[model samples]
Target chain A: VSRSQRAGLQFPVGRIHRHLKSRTTRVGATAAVYSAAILEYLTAEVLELAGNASKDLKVKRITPRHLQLAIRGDEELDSLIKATIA
Target chain B: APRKTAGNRLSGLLEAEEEDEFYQTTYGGFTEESGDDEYQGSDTEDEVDSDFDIDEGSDG
Candidate 1:
């Protein structure tokens, strides 16, 4: 029971498969699993920080303002949030 | 039965007592305590008190 077999593919399989196939790279069933996993982790981390910022302001909804404040310390995260806001 | 007198008896009602000078004064007393209790600490400790800059320009 491999991870690729258990975890279903999220992104377009053809794109990842074609890209890897062109590069002569071979992988398991869920070729895009690695990228999907990283995306999931990043999404969770960003949401956690943004949620905390909202909680600090006693707000029920998570807004861009909360996310902007949450990612202030890290320029990379802050830019990512700003890009999303724009 | 006990007898009532003009000075001690309550014929109709008793009169209220005279007001004291300190009765109207505010409750709390003053202390001689003085001097600043301001915090003294390193830069790192001061950094903990820093607030987020909400007005900062966007990096995007």
Candidate 2:
């Protein structure tokens, strides 16, 4: 089944490889699932770094990087990663 | 035996203690409050962290 459910917290590099061999142009669900997982990590790492930044500066909020520099982005293929990280 | 039962029932024995407790909502649980929907990613308060605007015209 297309359901990647129960794959567990580990990255499905194996699952991803299986789907890629077919190489359909627009990609598909599994690729998206990978995107989300990576995406969440991206945000997770971002927050951790931001906290490290704000930590020394005595800034109470995780608001910016430096001189207001901050976050980057990507796709709606992105939401799953965004949520799973939580 | 009769005297002992009668003495307590008339005075101290008449009074009894009960095991009581509160029936209530869930305890030691989530007990939460809000933040979400639409990603709502953009909202502002004192500092504007993006690109720091080309112009800075304000207080010395």
Candidate 3:
């Protein structure tokens, strides 16, 4: 968790990100909605151990979308994000 | 000064975050695709090849 606070990573307040990305159907939704939840959970957990460097990383809103952007389908990078978030 | 001041604390945190990212990628690969171990025909042949390209400077 310390790492998350390092550079002041801000988490999405409440569960806006989660609610928007669930298994259920909703308007203006995308496949990443579901995937994002997975990413968010992973990021939060990773910081707990290795520590969060940027305080602005934001623990709550991290989702599959974020993961995709972070990893850029690099495979190796994606894996890294998953481990830290999970 | 390594053991003193807030700079040390900030750097320590950054190191920790970087280290975490490193492991996250490793573990994520193992869980997602098993690093080319488990196959489900989910992706194309090219995708597989690119993923296994562990070396840097390869087509990302």
Candidate 4:
């Protein structure tokens, strides 16, 4: 699923088309898609967690730190990310 | 909703809510079954955070 789209590193790319393929890589494909979806979902989930973690935390402004902690410390959502992206 | 980043990219939106309204709901709610052929993992999703070198010279 990796494509030479943006850089030398092979970036995994796919569209959530209705057609599903039954192949050896289906599981990997599913995981990638699901991970991308959940990662998209975390766009807000991490923000909420960060805000709560710190009262001074801004509404929408966040940094790399927040993302790291969101994926590292947070349990439930982190688990989702792990499962989807694993 | 979705949180916006500096470059107007939708990358880091998870850390955006008010303190009073965070951590209400527990995790493990959405269980989308993709019907895998027994996919496995070492639970390593951390690679997404790493920076990769692009073939800068290849860009035309």
- DockQ scores for all the models shown? 0.01, 0.01, 0.02, 0.02
How would the docking of model 1 be graded?
incorrect
- Estimate the lDDT of model 4: 0.42
Fnat measured on candidate 2: 0.00
Top candidate on lDDT is 1
Interface RMSD over true interface Cα atoms for each candidate:
26.5, 21.9, 21.2, 14.6
When summed lDDT is taken over every stretch of 10 residues in candidate 1 chain A, the lowest stretch is A2-11
Cα displacement (angstroms), candidate 3, residue A13, comes to 30
Candidate 1 interface RMSD (Å): 26.5
lDDT of 3 at A21: 33
Question: Which tens-of-lDDT digit does each residue in A1-86 have in candidate 1?
Answer: 33333445333333443455567634433444565466666777777877776674653555544444546545777567446645
Model 4 chain A: ten consecutive residues of lowest lDDT = A16-25
Clashing pairs in 1: none
Per-residue lDDT tens digits of candidate 4, residues B1-60? 665654573333434432212322224222223442433435222232111222224999
Q: How do all the candidates rank in terms of lDDT, highest first?
A: 1, 4, 3, 2
Model 3 error, position A76 (Å): 15
lDDT of 4 by residue, A1-86 (tens): 23223222222324321122223222344444454555556666787766555457554444434454565577786666656654
lDDT of each: 0.45, 0.38, 0.41, 0.42
Better of 3 and 4 by TM-score: 4
TM-score of chain A of 1: 0.53
B1-60 per-residue lDDT for model 3 (tens digits):
355564758888997787556544553532223233422344221111222223333898
